[PDB]
Amino acid sequence: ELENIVANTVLLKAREGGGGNRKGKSKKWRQMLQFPHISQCEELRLSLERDYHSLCERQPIGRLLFREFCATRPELSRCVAFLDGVAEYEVTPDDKRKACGRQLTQNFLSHTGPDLIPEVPRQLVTNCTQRLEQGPCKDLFQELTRLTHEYLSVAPFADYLDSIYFNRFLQWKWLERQPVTKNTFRQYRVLGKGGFGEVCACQVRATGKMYACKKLEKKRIKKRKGEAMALNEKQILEKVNSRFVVSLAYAYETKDALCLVLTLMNGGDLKFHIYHMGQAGFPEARAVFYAAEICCGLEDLHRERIVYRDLKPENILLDDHGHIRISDLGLAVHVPEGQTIKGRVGTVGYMAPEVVKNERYTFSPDWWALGCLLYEMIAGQSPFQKKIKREEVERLVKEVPEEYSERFSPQARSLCSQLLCKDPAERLGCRGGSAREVKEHPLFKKLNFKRLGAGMLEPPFKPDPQAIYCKDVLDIEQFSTVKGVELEPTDQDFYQKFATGSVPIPWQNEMVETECFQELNVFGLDGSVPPDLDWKGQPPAPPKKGLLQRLFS
Numbered sequence: 317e318l319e320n321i322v323a324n325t326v327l328l329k330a331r332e333g334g335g336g337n338r339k340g341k342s343k344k345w346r347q348m349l350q351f352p353h354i355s356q357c358e359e360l361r362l363s364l365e366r367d368y369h370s371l372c373e374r375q376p377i378g379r380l381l382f383r384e385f386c387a388t389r390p391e392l393s394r395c396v397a398f399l400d401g402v403a404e405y406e407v408t409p410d411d412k413r414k415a416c417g418r419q420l421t422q423n424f425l426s427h428t429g430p431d432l433i434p435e436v437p438r439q440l441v442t443n444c445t446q447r448l449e450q451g452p453c454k455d456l457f458q459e460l461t462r463l464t465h466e467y468l469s470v471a472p473f474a475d476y477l478d479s480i481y482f483n484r485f486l487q488w489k490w491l492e493r494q495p496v497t498k499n500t501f502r503q504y505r506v507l508g509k510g511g512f513g514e515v516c517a518c519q520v521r522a523t524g525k526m527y528a529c530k531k532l533e534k535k536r537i538k539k540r541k542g543e544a545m546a547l548n549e550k551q552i553l554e555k556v557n558s559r560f561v562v563s564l565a566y567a568y569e570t571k572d573a574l575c576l577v578l579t580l581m582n583g584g585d586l587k588f589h590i591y592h593m594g595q596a597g598f599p600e601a602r603a604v605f606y607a608a609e610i611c612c613g614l615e616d617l618h619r620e621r622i623v624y625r626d627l628k629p630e631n632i633l634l635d636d637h638g639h640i641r642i643s644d645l646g647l648a649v650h651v652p653e654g655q656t657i658k659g660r661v662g663t664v665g666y667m668a669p670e671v672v673k674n675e676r677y678t679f680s681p682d683w684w685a686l687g688c689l690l691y692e693m694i695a696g697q698s699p700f701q702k703k704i705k706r707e708e709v710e711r712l713v714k715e716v717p718e719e720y721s722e723r724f725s726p727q728a729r730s731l732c733s734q735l736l737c738k739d740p741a742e743r744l745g746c747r748g749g750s751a752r753e754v755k756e757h758p759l760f761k762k763l764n765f766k767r768l769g770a771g772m773l774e775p776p777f778k779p780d781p782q783a784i785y786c787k788d789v790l791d792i793e794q795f796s797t798v799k800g801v802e803l804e805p806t807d808q809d810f811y812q813k814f815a816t817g818s819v820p821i822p823w824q825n826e827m828v829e830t831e832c833f834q835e836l837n838v839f840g841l842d843g844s845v846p847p848d849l850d851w852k853g854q855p856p857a858p859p860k861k862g863l864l865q866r867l868f869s
């Protein structure tokens with residue numbers, strides 16, 4: 317049991333700060349992130365669609381590079397400042413808002429000073445001054461915002477595309493397109509057993525950022541014919557850019573497995589925190605908070621027409637600051653507009669009635685599971701689970717109503733009840749309010765949801781950073797690595813479909829978070845001090861005074 321203590325101390329060190337000044341970065345990272353030749357970018361230039369929204373808004377490095385570009389020209393720079401102001405303004409609370417709102421009005425709409433855009437209609441200016449002072453609303457400046465973006469997205473965009481800044485962007489992009497492999501990362505101790513493989517911590521060598529690596533063993537996939545499940549979780553996480561769903565940064569392959577590299581949630585899973593963390597369950601305030609986050613998560617997925625179908629403690633995880641994110645989306649699936657889907661899938665205990673009955677549905681099942689979970693967090697026990705068998709529990713779900721203890725408050729009961737209403741058409745969330753009607757339950761008196769979704773609300777429990785919230789290494793399952801299955805050409809075509817490489821938005825973020833972008837992107841400072849002697853070894857006209865003093869006394 318040296319192995320246990322070893323692996324644990326390693327991981328915690330990586331989580332601490334790698335090896336000194338370089339924050340986990342390999343000593344040869346600059347080499348690893350060496351830009352390519354400009355000629356090496358043309359093929360790529362052509363590939364990239366000229367899309368304002370993609371190149372200047374969605375893609376953080378791309379956005380930075382544009383912003384940086386706009387700094388070179390004051391008429392632009394000031395636009396960017398304006399948009400910045402409004403984005404802040406819109407998230408500034410009621411009492412402080414008008415105070416903040418005037419500063420903008422006075423700065424960017426002074427009728428004596430220079431114009432904001434080349435053609436700003438005067439009538440549109442007077443309206444704001446008026447509309448503001450009486451009732452400062454959230455969509456106050458939408459008129460100007462819209463015009464500003466319409467301005468930038470045409471000429472300044474074109475001018476940028478045709479500037480050095482874009483050449484830089486192309487290079488940055490070239491790097492993200494470079495193939496990802498085993499060798500990109502450092503591996504650490506495993507943190508769990510998935511359906512199809514291990515799930516261990518890991519680190520990007522070049523950048524030192526920590527990720528979780530969900531391994532899916534190539535063989536175990538073919539045996540269980542879970543090709544759909546694997547590609548599905550990928551394609552889904554690839555698309556979802558939610559604050560409450562583990563984001564995917566890389567998809568690659570090895571000899572033995574396909575990997576998904578995912579946000580690393582150091583606070584561990586809610587299953588651990590409910591059971592193996594002192595007395596079972598959480599206080600009300602706490603249980604509620606998570607239910608509210610998990611709710612926002614579901615809102616996020618649903619809004620992208622995705623039903624999750626596997627909410628449960630195992631698959632909710634906690635981050636460094638004690639916030640949560642949904643995970644394991646193998647069972648998730650898209651729900652086309654105006655349609656319904658049937659699929660008897662999930663975990664025994666958390667599948668709602670209509671799923672168990674093998675009926676058609678849209679999003680009902682998730683709101684059920686939120687109920688189950690919100691129950692389980694207060695109660696300290698699954699509402700339908702000592703070992704029991706499958707058929708018994710399903711009966712328990714389909715017919716018997718839930719059984720409460722006295723930990724539940726008055727309103728705490730009603731919510732779980734309404735979520736565990738067995739009639740899906742009458743269930744909370746499914747009546748025709750979506751998340752809104754669940755958010756509006758009085759149990760969430762105290763939480764401003766607008767803020768929670770912006771991650772501005774502090775949770776009631778910050779994890780201990782020095783703690784590792786899961787089992788030790790040898791105290792973990794390991795199913796029979798079954799032989800009797802050869803990998804064949806048909807599988808290679810699929811692996812090609814899966815092993816995409818680095819996910820743009822996350823990847824780009826990684827570089828900015830690890831100061832790799834700033835450190836490497838900038839150009840003109842290093843080795844720029846105009847030199848003491850010209851090429852032929854003679855001083856300039858006139859010579860540098862610091863050399864003369866150094867050459868004599």
Ligand SMILES: NC(=O)c1cn([C@@H]2O[C@H](CO)[C@@H](O)[C@H]2O)c2ncnc(N)c12
Binds near residue numbers: 507515584585587644
């Ligand atoms: N796929 C994932 O997102 C993760 C799975 N685990 C662990 O592996 C188990 C598999 O559900 C969980 O209970 C966690 O202990 C994780 N641990 C930390 N961060 C993550 N992103 C995951």
